[PDB]
Amino acid sequence: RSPGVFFDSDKGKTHSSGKVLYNARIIPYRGSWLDFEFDPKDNLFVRID
Amino acid sequence: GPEEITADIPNVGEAALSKLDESGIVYIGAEVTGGDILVGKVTPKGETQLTPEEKLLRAIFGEKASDVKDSSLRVPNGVSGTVIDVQVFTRDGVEKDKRA
Amino acid sequence: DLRPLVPLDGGRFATSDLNDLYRRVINRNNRLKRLLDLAAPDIIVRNEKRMLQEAVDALLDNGRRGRAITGSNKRPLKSLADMIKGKQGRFRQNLLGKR
Amino acid sequence: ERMGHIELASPTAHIWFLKSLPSRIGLLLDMPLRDIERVLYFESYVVIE
Amino acid sequence: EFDAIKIALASPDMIRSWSFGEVKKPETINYRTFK
Amino acid sequence: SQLKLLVTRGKEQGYLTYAEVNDHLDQIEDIIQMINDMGIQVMEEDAAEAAAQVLSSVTTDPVRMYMREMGTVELLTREGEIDIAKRIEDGINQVQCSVAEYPEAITYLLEQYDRVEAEEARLSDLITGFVDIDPELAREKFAELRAQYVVTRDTIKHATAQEEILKLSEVFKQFRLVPKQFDYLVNSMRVMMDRVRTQERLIMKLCVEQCKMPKKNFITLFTGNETSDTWFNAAIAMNKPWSEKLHDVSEEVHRALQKLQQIEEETGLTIEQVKDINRRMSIGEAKARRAKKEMVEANLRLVISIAKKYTNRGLQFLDLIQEGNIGLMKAVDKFEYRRGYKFSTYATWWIRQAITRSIADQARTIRIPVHMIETINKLNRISRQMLQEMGREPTPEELAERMLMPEDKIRKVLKIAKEPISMETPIGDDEDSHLGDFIEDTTLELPLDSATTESLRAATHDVLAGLTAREAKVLRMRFGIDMNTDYTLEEVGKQFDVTRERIRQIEAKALRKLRHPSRSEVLRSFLDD
User: Fold this and answer.
1) Residue in F33, F62, F314 closest to C51 by CB
2) From which residue to which does any coiled coil extend (chain F) (predicted)?
3) Are the beta carbons of D32 and F54 closer than 8 angstroms?
4) E29, C5: Cβ pair inside 8 Å?
5) C-alpha torsion angle, residues F386, F388, F392, F393 (rounded to 10)
6) Distance of CA D6 to the CA centre of its chain
7) d(C-alpha F169, C-alpha F172), whole Å
8) Which CATH architecture does the domain made up of B1-94 adopt?
């Protein structure tokens, strides 16, 4: 994989109700792993590494 | 002590070698088959402490186990062919062989 | 014999990780003995006791303790219980499935 | 066939009765395993007499 | 010929009963001879 | 209910990656391993209530615990270190005066000094020098303690004696004797109080701790007279019922008075003198030891710095540090500010030799001499500046002319290194076969060669069957056959009762009949040229 930005979904399998999350990530070459990820509640969320 | 590559080996027939020159290495050309010695190596063993009734036999026919073992290279099961080539490396500060 | 120190052709050797694990635990035990006859400060001796508990605990098994304390090999040292359990271990592999 | 033994300079705790899942020494003495952990690694005393 | 395999905790006197001595040194072999 | 909720979630969904367990709460690794076996099947992208209770109770890396231990530790001040040092010195001086507070201590001093004057040791090895070149001064000075004592013997009859035993002590304080002589009378002084204190355990514990004897009655009796029977053998008229119980041991603890009068004799003076002597000693001694303990605390920051560079040469990081501490405490006995110095520069000498003298000792599975490790580290370093310099590489011949060693004393050391392989190494094939799975045996008798030998003792039994009883027995006699055997030729000369010479005749006769081709051809089968 190349350092860049990626929009994953991971259809199903999270919350086991059919919810299709959306967990966007920004993998740089040298630094932190910025990850925007949803919850079932449709409230965006952020993690650092 | 060091190991030797001689041809005079424990219990090797005169024709059982048949393919080793003075250095104990096969001739380029001699077809080889199962069990023929490519290189006759022998490693010493010091006072094996042989069995009784074999001390008896070796005393009966006057024969006695030598100092060197039979760690001699040989052609494996089945694989039969020709000896097309030989290389002889040697440690730099050491005597070289006749075939070398 | 079950933890041999076989000789490898070419001057090298081969041992099992049980050997060096035993060696490290014996080293920590000797050190704590030396400490006890010195009556050194209880901080250093308590660290020694902690370290020996660590050593024996990683000897009998590698998983419950936090870090499988590896060696110069960049692989974890393979302790006692790992020679009984698992696929590779005596039971599952060598004690029924044998040549 | 032979075996050797070792006389430890001091006592030390077997891992299998210590950190196994049901904690064989855990429920042998009414304690939480983290309590005996704090005891073992020289952290806080445990009263006797 | 045996039967009824057994297992239990091991006493320190048991473990002393097994051994034929006690290791003390962390040396293993002689590096010049391999004894 | 945070982690209780996450374990409820684990029983709900049945697999939980690092996202939750990092975000539903080292201790991280610990708690993930714990949540594994609810059972939950945790991953990275009687246990359920058992693990729930252990996950209901809210690091053990001994390096982290060691830093946390060292947290209340801090660099000590320079002249403050001098103050701690002088406190240690005051403790050692307390112990010195204590031993000199014991006169017969100096008596055994004169005993050792006479033995070296009778030549039982070295005149410079009896002491590590006085606090002052030629022994006849220090020896005559020791001889001064000889005469300075016998001037003291005139005065226990007490006003002039007490300050005469000390004048040979004040001279005593200006000396520095070797520790073995130092610790002997000390470890004898340690023996002195255990002997006397054990007596009161026979004296007092057999009265105050059994016979319902209140503490006042012994202390109000013993201490004040403390030597004779007025404190013990007068208590049995105390108008008491328990002082009435002082009869059954009255001949027994009176023995303990027979041992104390020995000890008063053995001490030469009253045991309460000797008591507050070694009491005072260990009083300051522990304080003296306490002074050293204080200083070693504020120098581990050196030792963690020292060991920071030796680490990855095959030794556990907490193993380096403990050997580091061993030198740091050994130097506390040896470091002297009496010159005026920083202990920091002094310590790393001891602490360097600590790590390195150990690192060459207990850091391989095959041990090697430090003078050989002396060699290997001399080659590998001298290998550097030759490989980097000449071009490609130092050949062992090229090392022979840098280091003029015979190159077969060298090349053997280059066979020395490269510690053994982990027999649990994984071989290729992706089959998980370890290295040890192919290392064969050499003790095994070749199953054919056993099958051969079973006919040998049968076959030789065959010809030895058709032998004469003498020859058949004498050959089994002569050779190691069918017993714990190989009786020598004189030994067969005795049992068969013939002759040491005659046996070899029938022995020669034995196989000469067996040397027959077409008679013993069976063993002819056991020949292959």
Assistant:
1) F62
2) none
3) yes
4) yes
5) 40
6) 18
7) 4
8) Beta Barrel (2.40)
